[PDB]
Paper text:
The majority of traits controlled by rhl transcription factor RhlR depend on PqsE, a dispensable thioesterase in Pseudomonas Quinolone Signal (PQS) biosynthesis that interferes with RhlR through an enigmatic mechanism likely involving direct interaction of both proteins. Here we show that PqsE and RhlR form a 2:2 protein complex that, together with RhlR agonist N-butanoyl-L-homoserine lactone (C4-HSL), solubilizes RhlR and thereby renders the otherwise insoluble transcription factor active. PqsE is a thioesterase that triggers transcription of the RhlR regulon through a hitherto cryptic mechanism, which we identify here as involving a significant chaperone-like component that enhances the stability of RhlR via protein complex formation. In common with many other gram-negative bacteria, two QS circuits use N-acyl-L-homoserine lactones (HSLs) as autoinducers, namely N-(3-oxododecanoyl)-L-HSL (3-oxo-C12-HSL) and N-butanoyl-L-HSL (C4-HSL), which are produced by autoinducer synthases LasI and RhlI and activate the LuxR-type transcription factors LasR and RhlR, respectively.
Loss of interaction was also found for variant RhlR-P61, in which we back-mutated residues in the DNA-binding domain to the wildtype sequence to assess the RhlR-regulatory activity of the stabilized protein. We then used a RhlR-P61-encoding plasmid vector to transform a ΔpqsE/ΔrhlR/ΔrhlI triple mutant of P. aeruginosa PA14. Here, the production of pyocyanin was restored to wildtype levels and not significantly altered by C4-HSL or mBTL, demonstrating that the stabilized RhlR indeed acts independently of PqsE and of these ligands. Crystallization of RhlR-P61 with mBTL showed the ligand in a similar position and conformation as in the other crystal structures determined here.
Numbering used by the authors:
A (entry chain B): 6 to 241
B (entry chain A): 7 to 241
Amino acid sequence: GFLDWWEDLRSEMQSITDSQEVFAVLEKEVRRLGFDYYAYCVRHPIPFTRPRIFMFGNYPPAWQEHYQAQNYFAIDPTIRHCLRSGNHIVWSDDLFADAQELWDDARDYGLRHGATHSCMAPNGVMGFLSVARSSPAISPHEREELRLRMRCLIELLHQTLTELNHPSLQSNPVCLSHREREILQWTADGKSSGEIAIILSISESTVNFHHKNIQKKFDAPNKTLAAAYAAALGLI
Amino acid sequence: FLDWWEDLRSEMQSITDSQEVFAVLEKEVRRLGFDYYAYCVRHPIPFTRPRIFMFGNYPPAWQEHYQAQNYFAIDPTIRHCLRSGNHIVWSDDLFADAQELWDDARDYGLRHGATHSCMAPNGVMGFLSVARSSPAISPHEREELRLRMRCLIELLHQTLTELNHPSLQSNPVCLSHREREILQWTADGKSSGEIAIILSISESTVNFHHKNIQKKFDAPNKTLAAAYAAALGLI
Ligand SMILES: O=C(CCCOc1cccc(Br)c1)N[C@H]1CCSC1=O
Ligand SMILES: O=C(CCCOc1cccc(Br)c1)N[C@H]1CCSC1=O
């Protein structure tokens, strides 16, 4: 029973105390769902041009090398920060219309049917979980139950890797003060350094002082990087 | 169980009226063992006064007592924060920094409940609450409640987007394939001049797309454009 599985998986997961044991249980659950291999990809929101991306999975090592050789992560439609209709998408030739060399290479290496689920933590980090198999296509009868079963896996995996303080989830910690924060919302809302100084009734000589410290907490050359990074991290 | 979720999907997909969706929702909140509910949409922008819509069948005395205290500003259950599981059961400790809200809430009979939040990638963060007075939420029904509520708010967000409700919609801003690359570099702290070197363009043309981006966001400077676009998932 789904709930018995959920409960038995939860008690089994909270019992884990190491980072390689969680992927072992995950591998056992992917086969339980009727699939052969999995893939977990964590995508941080910054830097906006080359975002930090971590990838773990038990795909065949031949594909793992081919994939890394072609930089397929740059054009993979299954790990793009998009708006999946249900945070979930079943692989189809339409999904890979703008990436035919990847879909052609994938089915060749035996990954002919699969699906990817995406969760977005409200701290910018997005998570992806893919499952793949060779012979049996995804039957419409098992589609929904697959969609629900994977949403529990990704969320559980996200929560337990967070509780274990995994590095792939730990982002650069930014200590923003309540006054510093309120200025940065005004900056990000388009107000100039002079305009800000009149609402808070402070000096322009001190709104730039706070800016100089916010930029130091983001290692920012300008305010733009600070305001944009803060918005992406949910810090404002 | 599964048979319930499957049967619930048929009722919603058949709905062709917004009020009919809230009606079916209310019937589900009763099935969970709760009297009242409340759904909330929190848009990310503006950063100083975000757009917030509120609906729910709370008692009328509370709704106009809630909105008369500006309680939406100090309510922990609608904070743009990272819940341990997109979920938190109400407790005296949860409302430590908002005691006037919790004391009034218990006085008015909203003594037991839980809130569940979903973060749509459009920057919108939806929240769903359920409340009752008599029976405390016992530890044995918690995890089953966390599951049933996650399904209820996901199907609620979707069903409401497929109906084009102007609570879920945000101001469109179609960004060009290159304007998006420029704003990404700008958002990464690069200057209008440095950007021209990376892409092999003229500073006048970098400063030319900027003028169009800030026009697409109604922005005074580049900082509003970069920050707004980052909040909406556009860069
Ligand atoms: O599963 C995913 C998620 C991103 C790629 O994940 C990978 C790929 C190769 C090695 C490793 Br490790 C992870 N994408 C699919 C698209 C079709 S083939 C494929 O890898
Ligand atoms: O659920 C929430 C916040 C979201 C709903 O807010 C409200 C409150 C009153 C009328 C309406 Br409509 C929405 N807060 C809880 C916790 C304390 S008592 C309460 O209403």
